[PDB]
Design an enzyme around this catalytic site. Structure first.
Site, PDB file in Angstrom:
ATOM      1  N   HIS C  38       0.826  -1.205   0.000  1.00 48.01           N
ATOM      2  CA  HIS C  38       0.000   0.000   0.000  1.00 48.01           C
ATOM      3  C   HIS C  38       0.862   1.258   0.000  1.00 48.01           C
ATOM      4  O   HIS C  38       0.365   2.354  -0.236  1.00 48.01           O
ATOM      5  CB  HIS C  38      -0.968   0.011   1.196  1.00 48.01           C
ATOM      6  CG  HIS C  38      -0.321   0.334   2.504  1.00 48.01           C
ATOM      7  ND1 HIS C  38       0.115  -0.639   3.381  1.00 48.01           N
ATOM      8  CD2 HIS C  38      -0.039   1.521   3.093  1.00 48.01           C
ATOM      9  CE1 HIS C  38       0.641  -0.064   4.447  1.00 48.01           C
ATOM     10  NE2 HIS C  38       0.558   1.247   4.299  1.00 48.01           N
ATOM     11  N   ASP C  87       0.065  -7.628   1.914  1.00 48.25           N
ATOM     12  CA  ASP C  87       0.529  -6.256   1.873  1.00 48.25           C
ATOM     13  C   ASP C  87       2.044  -6.215   1.789  1.00 48.25           C
ATOM     14  O   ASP C  87       2.723  -5.868   2.757  1.00 48.25           O
ATOM     15  CB  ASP C  87       0.046  -5.495   3.101  1.00 48.25           C
ATOM     16  CG  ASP C  87       0.301  -4.023   2.991  1.00 48.25           C
ATOM     17  OD1 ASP C  87       0.548  -3.560   1.855  1.00 48.25           O
ATOM     18  OD2 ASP C  87       0.245  -3.331   4.027  1.00 48.25           O
ATOM     19  N   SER C 180       4.637   2.759   8.041  1.00 49.92           N
ATOM     20  CA  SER C 180       4.333   1.671   7.104  1.00 49.92           C
ATOM     21  C   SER C 180       5.531   1.211   6.270  1.00 49.92           C
ATOM     22  O   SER C 180       6.344   2.022   5.830  1.00 49.92           O
ATOM     23  CB  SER C 180       3.208   2.083   6.159  1.00 49.92           C
ATOM     24  OG  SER C 180       1.958   1.695   6.677  1.00 49.92           O
TER      25      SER C 180
END
Ligand SMILES: *[C@@H]1O[C@H](CO)[C@@H](O[C@@H]2O[C@H](CO)[C@@H](O)[C@H](O)[C@H]2NC(C)=O)[C@H](O)[C@H]1NC(C)=O
EC number: 3.4.21.42
Lengths: 115, 147, 233
Positions: C38, C87, C180
């Site tokens: 992402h 992910d 992230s």
């Protein structure tokens, strides 16, 4: 519920709280994008969270340049970033904090950062 | 009419003459074979022919058996090899990786010598050169948590 | 990183800083960076820095910048109401990274059962994401987290898969937005001087408690296959 005694920050058990000399205390930190009207959530002690009513706060942990895209409720999308145009759309800043169009975040211009 | 003029034997510490005769004579041919680590350069070979000519001299007097030259060691990525005084047969070089951020993946020890066939060779890897690849997962300094 | 402490880039020399959007990655060799899907989904040519403790704009201009060649998103990402399974992504670099005291790669997990994370395992998280003070950190932050039962990530609609690691819960330490793609660095049980990337900061509830990390062990084959298939000739 009633506030707990705090020796350190770890004892308060929540980042919505902050310890002091009179050992814990409700932290009411400035919220990044804030909530509309009186639509903030509150914890067991009734301290103001930085999360709006009806929102679960779940999201990807990505740092959006213009902040997370937020609805009219104040709910941040799970993983959608604002564009430069919606950066200041659906945000609630109180003086001296004003929405910074370059970050999509409530900021005080007079504020000086240490770095 | 008379006698075929004889050609003298040689000082041959670097080669072996075949056939090995006590007396060589006009039009005799020897096969001159270099010993291991020696070659003749004309671009090099390990043997040549020489004919006893009518003037009592050997032909190909311009061909000698000389030490084999592996040449300047080739450099590798993320590693070093110190330049040797000679690159002739029997010479030894050492490769070392850029430590501590790289290490020798295929092992071998990084030590190479100049073999008889002209290649830099290692006892384990043969002529295959060392591969220097990143060391993974080692922090330069340990993370120290705030007390 | 919330609840964390100051960290030097030397403590996490594999940490990669992604800018616009603000995020992290993990260098895993001289041509490849590992991160979350992402993070590079609509960011196929990401701005990346290494080798610096600070990300002050002034300091970035003097830092090593990595030049992306190609971003490989995992085939299962967004393949199948929010679902953040698989992910994980790989960034191939144009130029080989030179390793040193501030820049070096983290290990990948092995394929044996020794690399099946469960109760008792611990990891380090690191990044420039939100803290208790600010929405972004200028200097690198880090924290140690325990692996936690998946049951504890899902409280207070979302798909939780075995490709996700739950971690946190202790002392409010957690990763937040801006972290992230960063590696959940775990001690290698077979070589205890080394760390490996067991997880990638992915998603979770509002930070401060628990979070979910991409379980890297289940992607090792795909990571190996992608690197081999896109070699460096
Ligand atoms: C020159 O001689 C060396 C003797 O070591 C040869 O080295 C061998 O190389 C082959 C593969 O090329 C390996 O299978 C052997 O194990 C090696 N010998 C060892 C490691 O002792 C080298 O190949 C030769 N050079 C040539 C034939 O060009």
């Amino acid at each position: 519920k009633k506030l707990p005694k705090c020796q350190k920050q770890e004892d308060c058990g929540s980042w919505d709280l902050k310890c002091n000399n009179v050992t814990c205390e409700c932290r009411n930190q400035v919220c990044g994008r804030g909530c509309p009207k009186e639509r903030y959530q509150r914890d067991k002690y009734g301290c103001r969270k930085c999360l709006c009513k009806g929102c679960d706060g779940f999201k990807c942990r990505l740092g959006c340049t213009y902040g997370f895209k937020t609805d009219k409720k104040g709910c941040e999308a799970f993983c959608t970033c604002n564009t430069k145009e919606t950066a200041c759309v659906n945000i609630w800043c109180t003086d001296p904090y004003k929405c910074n169009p370059e970050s999509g975040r409530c900021e005080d211009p007079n504020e000086e950062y240490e770095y | 009419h008379g006698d075929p003029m004889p050609c003298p034997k040689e000082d041959t510490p670097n080669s072996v003459w075949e056939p090995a005769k006590a007396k060589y004579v006009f039009r005799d041919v020897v096969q001159i074979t270099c010993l291991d680590g020696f070659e003749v350069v004309e671009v090099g070979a390990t043997s040549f022919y020489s004919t006893c000519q009518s003037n009592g001299k050997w032909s190909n007097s311009k061909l000698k058996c000389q030490p084999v030259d592996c040449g300047i060691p080739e450099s590798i990525e993320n590693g070093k090899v110190e330049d040797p005084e000679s690159t002739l047969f029997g010479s030894v070089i050492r490769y070392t990786c850029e430590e501590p951020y790289y290490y020798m993946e295929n092992g071998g020890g990084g030590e190479y010598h100049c073999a008889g066939n002209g290649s830099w060779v290692n006892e384990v890897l043969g002529p295959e050169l060392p591969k220097c690849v990143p060391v993974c997962g080692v922090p330069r300094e340990p993370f120290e948590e705030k007390q | 990183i919330i609840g964390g402490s100051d960290a030097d880039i030397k403590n996490f020399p594999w940490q990669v800083f992604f800018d616009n959007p603000w995020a992290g990655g993990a260098l895993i060799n001289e041509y490849w960076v590992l991160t979350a899907a992402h993070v590079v989904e609509g960011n196929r040519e990401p701005t990346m820095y290494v080798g610096s403790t600070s990300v002050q704009t002034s300091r970035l201009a003097k830092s090593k910048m990595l030049t992306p060649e190609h971003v490989f998103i995992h085939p299962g990402w967004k393949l199948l109401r929010t679902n953040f399974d698989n992910d994980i992504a790989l960034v191939r670099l144009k130029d080989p990274v030179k390793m040193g005291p501030t820049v070096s790669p983290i290990c990948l997990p092995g394929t044996s059962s020794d690399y099946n994370l469960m109760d008792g395992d611990l990891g380090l998280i690191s990044g420039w994401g939100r803290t208790e003070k600010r929405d972004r950190a200028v200097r690198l932050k880090a924290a140690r987290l325990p692996v936690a039962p998946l049951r504890k990530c899902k409280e207070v609609a979302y798909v939780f898969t075995p490709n996700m690691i739950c971690a946190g819960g202790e002392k409010g330490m957690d990763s937040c937005k801006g972290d992230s793609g960063g590696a959940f660095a775990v001690q290698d049980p077979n070589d205890k001087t080394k760390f490996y990337a067991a997880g990638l900061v992915s998603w979770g509830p509002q930070c401060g408690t628990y979070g979910l990390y991409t379980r890297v062990k289940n992607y090792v084959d795909w990571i190996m296959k992608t690197m081999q298939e896109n070699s460096t000739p």
